[PDB]
Amino acid sequence: TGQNQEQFLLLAKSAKGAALATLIHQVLEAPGVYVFGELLDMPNVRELAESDFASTFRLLTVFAYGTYADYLAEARNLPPLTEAQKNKLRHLSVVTLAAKVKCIPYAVLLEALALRNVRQLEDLVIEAVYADVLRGSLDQRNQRLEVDYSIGRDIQRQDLSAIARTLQEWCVGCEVVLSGIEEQVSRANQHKEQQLGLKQQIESEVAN
Amino acid sequence: SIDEIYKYDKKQQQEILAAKPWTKDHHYFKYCKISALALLKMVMHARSGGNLEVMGLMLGKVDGETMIIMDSFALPVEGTETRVNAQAAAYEYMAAYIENAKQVGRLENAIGWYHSHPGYGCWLSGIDVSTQMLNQQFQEPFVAVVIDPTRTISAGKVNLGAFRTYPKGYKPPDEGPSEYQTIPLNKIEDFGVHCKQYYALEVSYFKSSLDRKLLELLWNKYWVNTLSSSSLLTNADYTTGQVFDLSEKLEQSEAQLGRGSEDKLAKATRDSCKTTIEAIHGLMSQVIKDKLFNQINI
Amino acid sequence: KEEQFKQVFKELEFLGWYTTGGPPDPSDIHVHKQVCEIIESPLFLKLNPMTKHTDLPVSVFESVIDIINGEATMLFAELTYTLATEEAERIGVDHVARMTSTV
Amino acid sequence: FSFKKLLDQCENQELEAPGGIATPPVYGQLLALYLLHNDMNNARYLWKRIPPAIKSANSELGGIWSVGQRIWQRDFPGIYTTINAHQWSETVQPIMEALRDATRRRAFALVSQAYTSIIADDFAAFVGLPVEEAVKGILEQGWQADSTTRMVLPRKPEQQLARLTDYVAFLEN
Ligand SMILES: [Zn+2]
């Protein structure tokens, strides 16, 4: 998303209670809009929380943080969604699965997305690749989805530290590798010179 | 002035070509300066030939005892390494290419020929010597450049040589440092027969002020390509070819010990060492990649 | 030139054109249309040899035909690009860039 | 874990204390521990080293070797029968139960590799446990059990850079 962010933010700053509540049903039922971080952080939408349109805010929370199974568990409270919105939420659930592991078996996908046959799942993964949400390839024989690239959905202000917790884990990793080379290179010289020196001693005994 | 070398002085070249100082001394030409563009183009072409020998022409000029290579271009010829003066088959092509190159501002003329020795080192074979002798008889000043694309890749260091032949009957001086190279057994006989019929020039490289700037700025993104090299499978056929030759070298070194040259085993050991060291370096880059991108987790 | 390069680079094809300078201008569009007479969707590469900035002064563009004030006109849209992965090229480039034990 | 430390301690006591001839309970422990590690070549040569005086005075030692004969012949039902025959608390009894458990693990790991399909009675005799207990255990584990034929179908189950630098340092010099 990029154009839709500005296009809907312009309407978000110039909308009220009911208009915002219907705008949530309009942003969720629109192709390309998979991130709702800027829209959920709005004071105009914050007013809807714990108000007359609370379930719509909870629906936006599920679409920005939760999965399709979390929606199924709270379907009695949350407003009803069309096939397009159910699909979108399924795409985002596959993204969460892809964020967890690279190789997803069909069984985990069928259970998490609540699907019956393989083609439905395959068609949903196709719809994901087609909407530039996921990158990867499907393996029929081993019944597994190989994920090459998955987008970012969750913002997580409180859990943001975890990102740094992995980034530092990579940094330290580099800091080890780098030092490793520095040491190994030094050893590669430490041996060479030593050997040369030793050879120069052997060669000095030839005169005797 | 970094870019001074790029200035073309036509009258000065005509003056040098009319003077012919090389006729006064067969060791006149001692240095070979190659542009970064020509090196890259020749190495790219040499690699594109794979395990087959390819050849091309080099455009440039002369400056005192130095031969300067500014550019190069591939020749659509068959029989490089088997046909004496194989370049001759591309005569028409060469004339048109150069004519068209002059139309766009390539002023430098033919300075030499380059060809590849995939996996068998930089030197001149019997066919190469006949070809270069013809070129020095009819196309003087001319130089022969040999590249090993396979060894370049495997060693991570450019494997190139620049050579000039001696006229028929003329004997070389005491000079001949001869930097050691592993020569495969199917080539060593011919190498030995013709090794004293030519000499090696001192090679150096150059780039422009803009090339310097652009290469630093290229690095700011080109670093990614150094951590995604995959050298072990790119030219895997080289190490296998070398091992296939090494085995016959070891067969000869065994035959030397059998009954009864000067220590073939030590030569074969240095060859096997070099090949193995290159293989381990490949694994070193692979392990480095595994340490950086795989051993991270959630 | 095409008849010539096809003899030694048989597997290669004309993809677009290059020039030197700053951001794209009307002259580049005029020339791009002439290149469009040769190939359907050519790329346009621009190199700035007089750069003031810290990033590689190479930009690649595609041409888009848009409608501005009722006039259907040609414009350039910048594309992101990556550098090639050829081993021999990497070594050559590295050797050139460096220009000065086995491990 | 701790049995290996007691084995080394007994192996030290084997030569430090004598005197010519070592202590009989240490001989018993050393024999049973030599059976625990399946080192029958050490156990057979230990038993033949025992003087006939301790062989006659301490019959329990002969009762430990009677297990070894069955281990040497690889008769599993006989091993499980000979284990549950003698009692020598604190000294040999606490390690005989470890031998029984180790023989059970050894037999289970052997059947899981060496057999595709085996008779339930043969498998029960191989592990020592009765037919019902064995079939219950393997069905809980995941082996394919079949009635009538009484067949059980088993299911078969710098650190790196420094070494490389040493290899190149060797070849290059
Ligand atoms: Zn040659």
Coordinates of C-alpha atoms in Angstrom, one line a residue, chain A:
Chain A
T1 CA 0.0 0.0 0.0
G2 CA 1.1 3.6 -0.7
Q3 CA -1.5 5.6 -2.7
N4 CA -4.5 4.1 -0.7
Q5 CA -2.7 5.4 2.5
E6 CA -2.9 9.0 1.4
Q7 CA -6.3 8.6 -0.4
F8 CA -8.0 7.2 2.7
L9 CA -6.0 9.3 5.3
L10 CA -7.4 12.4 3.5
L11 CA -10.9 11.0 4.2
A12 CA -10.0 9.7 7.7
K13 CA -9.1 13.3 8.9
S14 CA -12.4 14.5 7.4
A15 CA -14.8 11.8 8.7
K16 CA -17.1 11.3 11.8
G17 CA -18.3 8.3 13.8
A18 CA -20.7 6.5 11.4
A19 CA -18.7 7.6 8.3
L20 CA -15.5 6.2 9.8
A21 CA -17.3 3.0 10.9
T22 CA -18.4 2.5 7.2
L23 CA -14.9 3.6 6.0
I24 CA -13.4 0.7 8.0
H25 CA -15.8 -1.7 5.9
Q26 CA -14.5 0.2 2.8
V27 CA -10.7 -0.1 3.5
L28 CA -11.0 -3.8 4.5
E29 CA -12.9 -4.5 1.2
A30 CA -10.3 -2.9 -1.1
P31 CA -7.5 -4.6 -3.0
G32 CA -3.9 -3.7 -2.1
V33 CA -4.6 -2.3 1.4
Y34 CA -3.0 -4.9 3.7
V35 CA -1.5 -2.5 6.3
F36 CA -3.7 -0.5 8.6
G37 CA -1.1 1.0 11.0
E38 CA -1.7 4.6 10.1
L39 CA -5.5 4.1 10.1
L40 CA -5.6 2.3 13.5
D41 CA -3.4 5.0 15.1
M42 CA -5.9 7.8 14.2
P43 CA -7.7 9.6 17.1
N44 CA -10.8 9.6 15.0
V45 CA -10.8 5.8 15.0
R46 CA -9.6 5.7 18.7
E47 CA -13.0 7.4 19.6
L48 CA -14.8 4.4 18.0
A49 CA -13.1 2.1 20.6
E50 CA -15.4 1.3 23.6
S51 CA -18.2 3.2 21.8
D52 CA -21.2 2.4 19.6
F53 CA -18.9 0.9 16.9
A54 CA -16.6 -1.1 19.1
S55 CA -16.8 -4.4 17.1
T56 CA -15.6 -2.6 13.9
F57 CA -12.5 -1.4 15.9
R58 CA -12.0 -5.0 17.1
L59 CA -12.3 -6.1 13.5
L60 CA -9.7 -3.6 12.4
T61 CA -7.4 -4.9 15.3
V62 CA -7.9 -8.5 14.0
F63 CA -7.1 -7.3 10.4
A64 CA -3.9 -5.4 11.6
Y65 CA -2.7 -7.9 14.3
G66 CA -4.7 -11.1 14.5
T67 CA -5.4 -14.1 12.2
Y68 CA -8.4 -15.8 10.5
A69 CA -8.6 -18.3 13.4
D70 CA -8.8 -15.4 15.9
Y71 CA -11.7 -14.0 13.8
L72 CA -13.5 -17.5 13.8
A73 CA -13.1 -17.6 17.6
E74 CA -14.8 -14.2 18.0
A75 CA -17.2 -14.3 14.9
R76 CA -20.3 -13.8 17.2
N77 CA -19.0 -10.4 18.4
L78 CA -17.2 -9.2 15.2
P79 CA -19.3 -7.8 12.2
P80 CA -19.9 -10.2 9.3
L81 CA -17.4 -10.1 6.4
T82 CA -17.8 -10.9 2.6
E83 CA -15.7 -13.5 0.7
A84 CA -13.2 -10.8 -0.4
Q85 CA -12.5 -9.7 3.2
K86 CA -12.3 -13.3 4.5
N87 CA -9.8 -14.0 1.7
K88 CA -7.7 -10.9 2.6
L89 CA -7.6 -11.9 6.3
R90 CA -6.6 -15.5 5.1
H91 CA -3.7 -13.9 3.0
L92 CA -2.6 -12.0 6.1
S93 CA -2.7 -15.3 8.2
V94 CA -0.5 -17.0 5.6
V95 CA 1.9 -14.0 6.0
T96 CA 1.9 -14.6 9.8
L97 CA 2.6 -18.3 9.2
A98 CA 5.4 -17.3 6.7
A99 CA 6.8 -14.9 9.3
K100 CA 7.0 -17.9 11.7
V101 CA 8.5 -20.5 9.3
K102 CA 9.8 -20.6 5.6
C103 CA 8.2 -24.0 4.6
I104 CA 4.5 -24.3 5.5
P105 CA 2.8 -27.7 5.1
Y106 CA -0.7 -27.8 3.5
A107 CA -2.2 -29.3 6.7
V108 CA -1.2 -26.3 8.8
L109 CA -2.6 -23.9 6.1
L110 CA -5.9 -25.9 5.7
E111 CA -6.4 -25.9 9.6
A112 CA -5.4 -22.2 10.0
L113 CA -7.4 -20.8 7.1
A114 CA -10.4 -23.2 7.6
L115 CA -10.3 -24.8 4.1
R116 CA -11.6 -28.1 2.8
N117 CA -9.7 -29.0 -0.4
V118 CA -6.2 -28.3 -1.8
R119 CA -7.2 -26.2 -4.9
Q120 CA -9.0 -23.6 -2.7
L121 CA -5.8 -23.2 -0.7
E122 CA -3.7 -23.1 -3.8
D123 CA -6.0 -20.5 -5.4
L124 CA -5.7 -18.4 -2.2
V125 CA -1.9 -18.6 -2.3
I126 CA -2.1 -17.6 -6.0
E127 CA -4.3 -14.6 -5.1
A128 CA -1.6 -13.7 -2.5
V129 CA 1.2 -13.8 -5.0
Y130 CA -1.0 -11.9 -7.5
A131 CA -1.6 -9.1 -5.1
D132 CA 2.2 -8.8 -4.4
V133 CA 1.6 -9.9 -0.7
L134 CA 3.7 -13.1 -0.9
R135 CA 6.5 -14.4 -3.0
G136 CA 7.3 -18.1 -3.3
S137 CA 6.4 -21.4 -4.9
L138 CA 4.0 -24.3 -4.1
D139 CA 5.2 -27.9 -4.0
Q140 CA 2.4 -30.4 -4.7
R141 CA 4.3 -33.7 -4.1
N142 CA 5.6 -32.9 -0.6
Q143 CA 2.4 -30.9 0.0
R144 CA 4.3 -27.8 1.1
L145 CA 4.4 -24.0 0.5
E146 CA 7.9 -22.6 0.0
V147 CA 7.9 -18.9 1.0
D148 CA 10.5 -16.6 -0.6
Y149 CA 9.3 -13.3 0.7
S150 CA 6.5 -12.1 3.0
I151 CA 5.4 -8.5 3.8
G152 CA 5.1 -6.7 7.1
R153 CA 1.6 -6.3 8.7
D154 CA 1.9 -6.0 12.5
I155 CA 3.3 -2.7 13.8
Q156 CA 3.5 -3.7 17.5
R157 CA 4.5 -0.6 19.6
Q158 CA 5.1 -2.6 22.8
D159 CA 6.7 -5.7 21.0
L160 CA 8.9 -3.4 18.8
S161 CA 11.8 -4.3 21.0
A162 CA 11.7 -7.9 19.6
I163 CA 12.7 -6.6 16.2
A164 CA 15.8 -5.0 17.8
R165 CA 16.3 -8.2 19.8
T166 CA 16.8 -10.0 16.5
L167 CA 18.7 -7.1 14.8
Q168 CA 21.2 -7.1 17.7
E169 CA 21.3 -11.0 17.4
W170 CA 22.4 -10.4 13.8
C171 CA 24.8 -7.5 14.7
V172 CA 26.6 -9.7 17.4
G173 CA 26.6 -12.4 14.7
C174 CA 28.4 -10.1 12.3
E175 CA 30.7 -8.9 15.2
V176 CA 31.7 -12.6 15.7
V177 CA 32.2 -13.4 12.0
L178 CA 34.3 -10.2 11.5
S179 CA 36.5 -10.9 14.6
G180 CA 36.8 -14.6 13.4
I181 CA 38.3 -13.5 10.1
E182 CA 40.5 -10.9 11.8
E183 CA 41.9 -13.8 14.0
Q184 CA 42.1 -16.4 11.2
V185 CA 43.9 -14.0 8.8
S186 CA 46.3 -13.2 11.7
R187 CA 46.9 -16.9 12.3
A188 CA 47.4 -17.4 8.5
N189 CA 50.3 -14.8 8.8
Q190 CA 51.5 -16.0 12.2
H191 CA 52.1 -19.5 10.7
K192 CA 53.6 -18.2 7.4
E193 CA 56.2 -15.9 8.9
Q194 CA 57.0 -18.6 11.5
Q195 CA 57.5 -21.2 8.8
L196 CA 59.7 -18.8 6.7
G197 CA 61.8 -18.1 9.8
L198 CA 62.2 -21.8 10.5
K199 CA 63.1 -22.4 6.9
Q200 CA 65.8 -19.6 7.2
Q201 CA 67.2 -21.5 10.2
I202 CA 67.4 -24.8 8.3
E203 CA 68.9 -23.0 5.3
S204 CA 71.5 -21.4 7.6
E205 CA 72.7 -24.9 8.7
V206 CA 73.6 -25.9 5.1
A207 CA 76.8 -23.8 5.4
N208 CA 78.0 -26.0 8.3

